[PDB]
Design an enzyme around this catalytic site. Structure first.
Site, short mmCIF file in Angstrom:
data_model
loop_
_atom_site.label_atom_id
_atom_site.label_comp_id
_atom_site.label_asym_id
_atom_site.label_seq_id
_atom_site.Cartn_x
_atom_site.Cartn_y
_atom_site.Cartn_z
N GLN A 124 -10.71 -4.87 -1.00
CA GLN A 124 -9.66 -5.76 -2.21
C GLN A 124 -11.52 -5.41 -3.25
OE1 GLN A 124 -7.25 -6.63 -2.26
NE2 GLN A 124 -6.66 -6.44 -0.16
N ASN A 155 5.54 -9.95 6.59
CA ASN A 155 4.60 -8.38 6.40
C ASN A 155 4.11 -8.90 8.50
OD1 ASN A 155 2.35 -7.63 7.31
ND2 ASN A 155 0.70 -8.46 6.03
N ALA A 197 1.61 -3.32 3.06
CA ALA A 197 1.79 -4.58 3.56
C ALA A 197 1.37 -5.05 1.73
CB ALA A 197 1.04 -5.40 4.51
N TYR A 204 -11.00 2.20 4.25
CA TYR A 204 -9.62 2.00 3.22
C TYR A 204 -10.49 0.92 2.52
CZ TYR A 204 -5.03 1.60 2.75
OH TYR A 204 -3.64 1.31 2.44
N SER A 247 0.94 -1.14 -0.02
CA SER A 247 0.31 -0.21 0.07
C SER A 247 0.69 1.25 -0.22
CB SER A 247 -0.77 -0.58 1.21
OG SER A 247 -1.72 -1.07 0.59
N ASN A 270 -8.61 -0.55 -1.66
CA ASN A 270 -8.21 -1.12 -2.82
C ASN A 270 -9.13 0.38 -4.33
OD1 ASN A 270 -5.49 -0.89 -1.76
ND2 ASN A 270 -5.35 -3.57 -1.18
N1 LIG Z 1 -3.96 -5.94 -1.30
C1 LIG Z 1 -3.27 -7.48 -1.55
C2 LIG Z 1 -2.54 -7.73 -0.37
C3 LIG Z 1 -1.36 -8.52 -1.06
C4 LIG Z 1 -1.51 -9.50 -1.71
C5 LIG Z 1 -0.75 -10.61 -1.83
O1 LIG Z 1 -0.53 -11.26 -3.15
O2 LIG Z 1 0.25 -11.14 -1.40
C6 LIG Z 1 -2.47 -9.20 -2.66
C7 LIG Z 1 -3.30 -8.21 -2.69
O3 LIG Z 1 -4.70 -8.08 -3.99
#
Ligand SMILES: Nc1ccc(C(=O)O)cc1O
Ligand SMILES: Nc1ccc(C(=O)O)cc1O
Ligand SMILES: Nc1ccc(C(=O)O)cc1O
Ligand SMILES: Nc1ccc(C(=O)O)cc1O
Ligand SMILES: Nc1ccc(C(=O)O)cc1O
Ligand SMILES: Nc1ccc(C(=O)O)cc1O
Ligand SMILES: Nc1ccc(C(=O)O)cc1O
Ligand SMILES: Nc1ccc(C(=O)O)cc1O
EC number: 3.5.2.6
Length: 352
Positions: A117, A334, A309, A147, A61, A149
């Site tokens: 997500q 992480n 992360a 929050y 992020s 994505n």
């Molecule tokens: N937001 C996300 C965080 C980690 C991953 C991953 O594949 O580790 C994928 C993601 O879409």
């Protein structure tokens, strides 16, 4: 490398790495306009490859800070406005819930509860449209921060449309190249494979999985040198020669919304300096937002920061413009966020 910086860094980071069992870590301290680098452990445990200043880490992020500055650069260029409706840049978004949802709302997680997500099954451009068309908001726009994505990710994709460039092309030409970030990648090239660290989740070597709006939300990989350079660029924007990039950094560090002591910028999050460390040290946290009317331009007396992360990586960037002081912490595991902010706090408070 003064002994003041050396001792506080090693005194703070060595126990953190042991206590959190972090395989590899890179740290940069920016102090009076000069970077100082520190590296520990392994980028690749199986192949015994050490972390170096050329090791690529997944930013997670922290990528959103690049997205926010690129958006701010597009604003400075006169290509978009944060006050424009989302529908202006995606007219196929004909669903009635998108009335009153602006690019600012997407950028700052205040559209009305867009999900954390984008679903893994959403792949094509048709899938994405269908996903956003069918989304039902829980709240009115500009009332709650959640929050997401899918919110900042869509802001990034829409923000580069008037340019006629892809997001990746736009980021490379308008942010990476002008700032001399020559080892920062959305997609790691084969030539850089050897430098690309493995992340570690429960002992398993892992890299970030592909997904919709990944470049815009969580897909940047970088080195400790480039990230130090990124911090300096954000510490002193008016030293950057590029006219619109200079302004775009400032727009990204503006205070658009308040939730308690936290202020939401574009990508960047801020607090007034001095900060109560307890204010900075949960799957979903819905918080009502106070609109800052008008938004406060980049305040130099600020703790500006972002955690990041992925499955196998944990990153942290923090800086105080007033003190010309900052830190970057990149690790291939992480580990808990409070542990990052605490260590960063310990270091920057010792140096300020
Ligand atoms: N937001 C996300 C965080 C980690 C991953 C991953 O594949 O580790 C994928 C993601 O879409
Ligand atoms: N959940 C909600 C969604 C949208 C609006 C609106 O006024 O557009 C109000 C709401 O209470
Ligand atoms: N250059 C690379 C690109 C992608 C991956 C991956 O694991 O997805 C690994 C690489 O070494
Ligand atoms: N060979 C390995 C030994 C230890 C670990 C770990 O995550 O502790 C990972 C490995 O791939
Ligand atoms: N597995 C994948 C899922 C989604 C996407 C995308 O671009 O949305 C890409 C992928 O390689
Ligand atoms: N007010 C200021 C704004 C920007 C900078 C800089 O170095 O970019 C310095 C300042 O004293
Ligand atoms: N620099 C600082 C030192 C201590 C505290 C505190 O709340 O104890 C806050 C600060 O901003
Ligand atoms: N110790 C502190 C207590 C409160 C605040 C604040 O900004 O409210 C800052 C501090 O450094």
């Amino acid at each position: 490398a003064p002994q003041q910086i050396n001792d506080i860094v090693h005194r703070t980071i060595t126990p953190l790495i042991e206590q959190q069992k972090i395989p590899g870590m890179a740290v940069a301290v920016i102090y009076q306009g000069k970077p100082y680098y520190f590296t520990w452990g392994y980028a690749d445990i199986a192949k015994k490859q050490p972390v170096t200043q050329q090791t690529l880490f997944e930013l997670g992020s922290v990528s959103k800070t690049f997205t926010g500055v690129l958006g701010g650069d597009a604003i400075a260029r006169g290509e978009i406005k944060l006050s424009d409706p989302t529908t202006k840049y995606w007219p196929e978004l004909t669903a009635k819930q998108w009335n009153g949802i602006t690019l600012l709302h997407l950028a700052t997680y205040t559209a009305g509860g867009l999900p954390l997500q984008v679903p893994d099954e959403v792949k094509s451009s048709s899938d994405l449209l269908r996903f956003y068309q069918n989304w039902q908001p829980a709240w009115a726009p500009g009332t709650q921060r959640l929050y997401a994505n899918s919110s900042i990710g869509l802001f990034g994709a829409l923000a580069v449309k008037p340019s006629g460039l892809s997001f990746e092309q736009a980021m490379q030409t308008r942010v990476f190249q002008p700032l001399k970030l020559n080892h920062t990648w959305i997609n790691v090239p084969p030539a850089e494979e050897k430098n690309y660290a493995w992340g570690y989740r429960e002992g398993k070597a892992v890299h970030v999985s592909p997904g919709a709006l990944d470049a815009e939300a969580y897909g940047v990989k970088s080195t400790i040198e480039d990230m130090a350079r990124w911090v300096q660029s954000n510490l002193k924007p008016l030293d950057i020669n590029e006219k619109t990039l200079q302004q775009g950094i400032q727009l990204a560090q503006s205070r658009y919304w308040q939730t308690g002591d936290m202020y939401q910028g574009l990508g960047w999050e801020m607090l007034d300096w001095p900060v109560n460390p307890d204010s900075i040290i949960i799957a979903l946290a819905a918080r009502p937002v106070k609109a800052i009317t008008p938004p406060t331009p980049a305040v130099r007396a600020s703790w500006v920061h972002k955690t990041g992360a992925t499955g196998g990586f944990g990153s942290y960037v923090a800086f105080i413009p007033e003190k010309e002081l900052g830190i970057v912490m990149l690790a291939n595991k992480n580990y808990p966020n409070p542990a990052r902010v605490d260590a960063a706090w310990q270091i920057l408070n010792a140096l300020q």
